[model samples]
Target chain A: AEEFPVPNGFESAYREVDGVKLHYVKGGQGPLVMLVHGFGQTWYEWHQLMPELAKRFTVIAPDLPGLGQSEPPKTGYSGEQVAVYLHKLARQFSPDRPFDLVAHSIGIWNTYPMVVKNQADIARLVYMEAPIPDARIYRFPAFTAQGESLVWHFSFFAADDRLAETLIAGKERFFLEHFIKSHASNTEVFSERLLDLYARSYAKPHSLNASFEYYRALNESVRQNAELAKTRLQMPTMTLAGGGHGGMGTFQLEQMKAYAEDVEGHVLPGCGHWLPEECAAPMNRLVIDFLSRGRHH
Target chain B: AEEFPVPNGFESAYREVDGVKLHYVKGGQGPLVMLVHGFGQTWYEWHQLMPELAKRFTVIAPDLPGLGQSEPPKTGYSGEQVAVYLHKLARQFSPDRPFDLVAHSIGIWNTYPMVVKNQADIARLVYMEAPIPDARIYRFPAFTAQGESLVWHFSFFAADDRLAETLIAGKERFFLEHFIKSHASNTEVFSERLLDLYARSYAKPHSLNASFEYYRALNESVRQNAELAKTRLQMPTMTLAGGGHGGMGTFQLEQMKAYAEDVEGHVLPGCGHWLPEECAAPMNRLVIDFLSRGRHH
Candidate 1:
């Protein structure tokens, strides 16, 4: 078996929220910017973009409860359930200032419940290419494609505990393959140190199951967010897709514009679903520009 | 662990290729149109477009070497290796006539070697959102998101035998979770039977190591392809991708147009990487439209 080693610059900040010891990465010494990763991932998705964000802002990247290096909460989970905890984290971390939010893929969906439920205390928002369903279309052909390739993920939503465990246990490489290559501009872009880091993190006895639970609880959060949107987020929001490939790109700009009044959308070129990694420079630029719109005012 | 059962409508075609049995799926009957899938998936991704394409032409979709249901060969196992094997399969299946080719994502990369080696005779080609790097850019970015989440697939390119074995032994669910939910347009679209089918197929003992070997052999092929543009497909080619959405939509289309004269392109809306399943009607229409062109004398 391969050994998972700690890289050179690993650091953490700890806090107690709702009886859970939450660990997060804190950097820089300016405005607060919290980075959230998608399902099955830890807070590390932002590693590439964090140093840049940290240069200008007090970046706080957290392992959402039950994922990554964070301690999982007992009895309480789900994005909505976790949003409540994040609301607490934001308050605990940034006692005096409203933070700028950045999220990718499922992280975007996870944030919606927080923002919609008024769990996020924020001045602005950034939703990187996440699977935020069109509220009206539940049976989007998109969802079918989602379930077809990896049924276990959907099973987390509706499947019983026994089933989720089995599915998670049986298809570990599928997850590795999907994340490492499927969404990458090229599948073989990562190094050995990087791969070992993840495989070990995943094999951490209870962590994978905890992640499965997060997926299981996602539906409830989505349902709750749909209802909460009656109080739609009034923040200056931005949705950036990876590339100008198709319907997934700036297409959502029209939809977000139709509703948010001040939303900005753009698609980076030559990127895949892993937007932040595929084109980190532009993502950093866009987030700065979108947030700096306030500095101009 | 959850068992992945084969889905209904299981139509498989098996033929011996280089000492192993290669299997794929065919949905409809007419003139032959071969469907190729990229990394981490089987022929099932063409599920949405297969029936539609099969309506007018015979859709031959195969599980490329060492993935899904396809048999792994004793030697020559990378995309370049499989390209040669696929050439043989195409020739063996359509001995009397050259077939039209439709490939998505990395499948296009695999197709490149076959075209260059003159191993397969193809009438026309459609490369859907495949990442064909124009020039090698040395300063590669870290896939921190994939790295952090433990789904570092590209890591396999450099992963030694020990790492490869560790990944294979892990439950297939981990891989399934990362790919199916993150990339698929929808998370709940696939049925239970189909998910299990894919899971079981990939779970086959030898499949994991063999799949890793494909990445292991990638650099050698990229080096070989670096000097062979004169072999640049001189056929009628149509490359489709989305602007502000993806590289293949406009970026690849333009790059592809530079090499092939009769190139046409378009961008579909609200789609991610899984175009075939994301919006089959439009993508299939795009494929059909592309294939139908310049056919008349």
Candidate 2:
């Protein structure tokens, strides 16, 4: 396992969740806000948004199982497994109160189920750049500019688990750094320090397998999400599209609309898939306002 | 460009085609059989099949521009551009007679255009596991076992060039090796030495970018292929699907049928995407028989 220096004002700790020691970071005080990082990233991915959101809400960001400081279990990388574990962790953090939730990419795979089953536990939800549960509605409009940019790589990563793991072994840092840099609209926004931080964490043992396992389990994830999608999520939902080529721009909105009873879609112009980093200010502002809108405590 | 030793009895040469110098391996005698490799691989991918095929036909394998020994270009990774360049290379080798073509993955993207425009120059063509042009016709039947195994990785690789390149940079060996291992039904068939050679070749400067350029151009490739589909390819065509878990496996046959006048599909049972290496004996025999079917000279 590798360690990184945490940003000032934030404290780190581990909680036993479903037989695994899950690492998470926290700061501030008020209604709770849980931040779940996407694939190839840890809690650190939420750093930029954490400080500001922390000022208003008690923000908690945890590294997913087998990633970052979280201990790798014998096996449990599936969305269903992660959801059950994460819910256990959330109860440890806020035993009785419902908290606002924010998740990106593969993080959505785990957390979406949480929102589906325990809607009462989530005050509001924000799903970042990822495909929503139902494949029928999830279409890549080929020949269009968006579909053109989107189509081929999906199968490349999801095609073969052993192949991806074999290829990624021994080069975790380069792969992670490239992933961070590439997902942002402007490369400069992803600093060397940030890139190095992720690369180091990803370089740890079991990281690549743990990472690929998420993809390996995706077909199951999709089926689970599809089944979950049959029921509508009643909580307030905000779907974000990183506007200027940064994040999954509006890709999740239509799906979000279909999945949630009350939902709104916004495009963060000039951002890419790495929403929290690329357009943190706007993301924080939008997320903060959405989380604050309907709660009176 | 970095160098790797070639198969015995085969000789290497460079040709200036379309303002780029391409490296290729050739041996044997008789009707020319040109082999174009897929992404993240080099001419070396054909090493196993080349020797056997050489006894009956003159086999030529060339690395695609911007990948392997081929010099990286400032631009022009599109299908049309590569097709023009490859045709030029083919002319250099056998200007007197039409040759046979065997292309895999991105190679299909490049050579598809050639078979479309210059059908008179190709006597027979074999397209390994890759979808033919037109996203409308390129649907993977999800919920089926094959679709379950196939989806996800396509968008992952095609999503962002910078991210893919950044992730792939220093970890070329790992990435390439994993890709090779993952796509094959029989992983043991891809020897460590062969994996090392590919990884080394992929580790060179601009190699990742060059390889991704092929995918970046895929949107255009699809468009071109769709346009070319309007005019059918008259040459005899064979589409091989890695039956078990390897290549496209009959996926492209229907699509190829839509684009070609004479098309047949074969499934290499228990094979993956790396047709030449995974099922060399059967692939070679099938290819030889197909190429020999209708010629008296």
Candidate 3:
């Protein structure tokens, strides 16, 4: 079922998910497919893969609350909160119909709950470099001080609001660009133009604060995920990693096998954290193949 | 024995060591007692303890190479090079007669080698919150992201020279004051005047780079310290920690017990990283008692 036909290829809409407005992009016309982006990135990350996936399924991608075009709430950026938000977003698109879900990084935190609690309406699930909710063995280890420096901003700029806001205020471009270039396998893939676009979006009022809020809620997410892990997900699921420098690689996939009953894991060669953009061809193929498989449940 | 007398009670002088000029402060009269200060600190850190210690011994406090009034070398901030530099400084103080040594933080890295190699001449050694060489377990564990953010600067700024220099240039006072305030158990102890003095010194060109160099060479220090640890030190030694925050507490003392034949450890309750200023009374008494003990060997 189609939501609406807009000027461009995809339709943009805002929905009230838990008292706050959430911005999302929708395209295609078939079984519902949800694409979730991670921290410091909006739904724009799925740009390359959207067209390919649209051919087979109705693609719905939303900006997590407090990020991108989504209106940040006063609180509630935790994994559980965002999961509830995704559930509401999915209901608006499919209503009674079950939909396939795909999420990356922090998005996985939000979607994990959907896989656990609302699995009745979910067909298949795909997680890309998602940080492990219970056991966060998916992190880039701080083997050296230089290694620690890589993820420094995740904790540094997000820890103290006063300090973070003051330091990051007129330097959003530098901060965002550095973060993008630093995490990529090939920094050139994140062009200057794309960085500027993302940086501009992040510079909006309370956007940086909202982005940091995701990091701020990580501990709670870990706790909540651990609590939710008691009951295993019976849905057919798959996990992917960027198997390059600075990527979590197959780390999460290996860890996920223990928690989920039916699961497959993959690593995109020569890709870093930016999976959809870096390895669109391989990712799209994998997603299509996974969702096409008859419902295992 | 007195160098050029400078105003209030202390004599200052410069010694040529390994082609770099080393600045030192000397006061009181008796057996040589060398005071070595750590990173972000000069001989000034010993100001509170200098007078008290000088009452019984000739106190000699030196600014470690590339910090404070001491000149930064083209390189060589490693544990071994600095250890050699301190050995030369100690020799300058008392060529034939062995001297008592007191070092804190990074100072301990340099002093550890002296205690091991030059133990025949050295009377007694005292390490305050010393991150020991080779096996340096003298750090606060960052269990939470907030905790990691607190110590982020140590690894982050030190990881890259260009990045550190640019960010720290104009914001010297803010950075220095924040560092001092954040690390101290009682922030009140570090008076405004002292903060200003330290900030001014840190603001100088190459200062941050020089300071970060200590962190940059930590791997090398670890390697060198491990190599040096092959033979244990046979001397009366003691390590003190600030009980509150940033203080290594009794961790180093515990680790040191395995490396040295005779070593004592103490933690100053309600004190943080700034041992001399935060708990000068206890630190002085501990240093005095530790040094006053006869060499077991």
**Number of the predicted model whose TM-score against the real structure is largest:** 3
Deviation of model 3 at B141, angstroms = 5.5
Would you estimate the TM-scores of all the predictions?
A: 0.50, 0.76, 0.89
Q: For residues A60-96, could you state the per-residue lDDT of candidate 3 as single tens digits?
A: 8898887888888645877888788888889888897
The true-versus-predicted C-alpha distance at residue B201 of model 1, in Å, is 1.4
Off-target runs (Cα >4 Å) in candidate 1 are A1-297, B1-11, B27-30, B133-140, B143-152, B156-158, B162-165, B168-170, B191-193, B242-249, B294-297
Name the candidate, 1 or 3, with the larger DockQ value: 3
Model 3, residue pairs in steric clash: none
TM-score of chain B of each: 0.81, 0.91, 0.91
The TM-score of candidate 2 is 0.76
Per-candidate DockQ vs. reference: 0.03, 0.19, 0.28
Q: Is candidate 1 or candidate 3 better by lDDT?
A: 3
lDDT of 1 at A249: 61
Here, model 2's chain A TM-score works out at 0.91
C-alpha RMSD over true interface residues, each candidate: 14.6, 5.6, 4.6
Per-residue lDDT of candidate 2, residues B176-260 (tens digit): 6666766678889767887877877777767767777676666677777767777888888999888886466656787777787
Model 3 ranges with Cα > 4 A deviation = A1-8, A135-154, A294-297, B1-7, B133-146, B149-154, B191-193, B294-297
lDDT of 3 by residue, B126-199 (tens): 87775675533323333343333235555555544255565566777766766776677878987777777787
lDDT of each: 0.62, 0.75, 0.74
lDDT of 2 at A105: 84
Local accuracy of candidate 1 as per-residue lDDT tens digits, B1-297: 212222344366687877768777775665677888876567877777766666577678877777777777667754566787788887777788778888876687677777656624778888876555334211122121111111223343334434444544556655554555455544455556566676676667777666666656655555656765556676677776643222234566767765666677776666656676566678878887777663421
